[PDB]
Amino acid sequence: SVKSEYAEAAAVGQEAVAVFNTMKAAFQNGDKEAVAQYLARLASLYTRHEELLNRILEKARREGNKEAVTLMNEFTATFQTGKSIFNAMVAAFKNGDDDSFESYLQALEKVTAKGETLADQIAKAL
Ligand SMILES: COc1ccc(S(N)(=O)=O)cc1
Q: Ligand 1 mean position to 25 CA, how many Å?
C-alpha cells in the first residue's frame, strides 16, 4: 500500500540522518577519508529516498488523493532544496573549502529538521 511504501521511504530517510551525523563527527575530527565514504553513501541514500518519494506521489495522484498530493508536492520541493545543498557540500568537499562545507552542513540540518513536521503529516494523509 502507499502507506507502507511511505514507511519504507521514511526509514531510508532515517538512514541518511544517521549516516549524516557520523559524517558530521568525522568532518569535525578531520577524518577526510571517512567523510568521503559517508558522502558517497549519502548520495545513494538520497537518490533512493527521492525515488521512493516520486513513486508515492505518482500513486497518490493516480488515487486522486488530493490532500496527499498537496503535501507530497510541498515535501518534494523541500527535498530538492535539501538535495541542492547536499550537492553543494559535496563540491565544497572536493574543493577543500571547509568553511563552506560547514555552512552547507548546517543548512542541510535546518532543511531536514524543518521538513520533519510535514513528513509527519504525509504519513497520516496517505
Ligand atoms: C536531502 O534533503 C532532505 C532530506 C529529508 C527531508 S525530511 N526531514 O524527511 O522532510 C527534507 C530534505
A: 20
Total domains, the chain: 1
Q: Which domain range does residue 101 map to? A: 1-126
Angstrom distances, CA of residue 82 to CA of 76, 89, 98, 121:
10, 11, 19, 19
Q: Closest Cα to atom 5, ligand 1: which residue? A: 112
Ligand 1 pocket test target in 19, 54, 74, 79 with most atoms within 8 Å of CB:
79
Question: What number of other Cβ atoms are within 10 A of residue 85's Cβ?
Answer: 20
Å from CA of 104 to ligand 1 middle? 14
- Is residue 38 within 8 A of residue 90, CB to CB? The reply is no
Residue located nearest, by CA, to atom 6 of ligand 1: 112
Give how far Cα 59 sits from Cα of 16, 66, 76, 80, 126, Å: 24, 11, 14, 19, 10
SS3 of residue 43 by DSSP: helix
Q: What are phi and psi of 113, to 5 degrees?
A: -70, -35
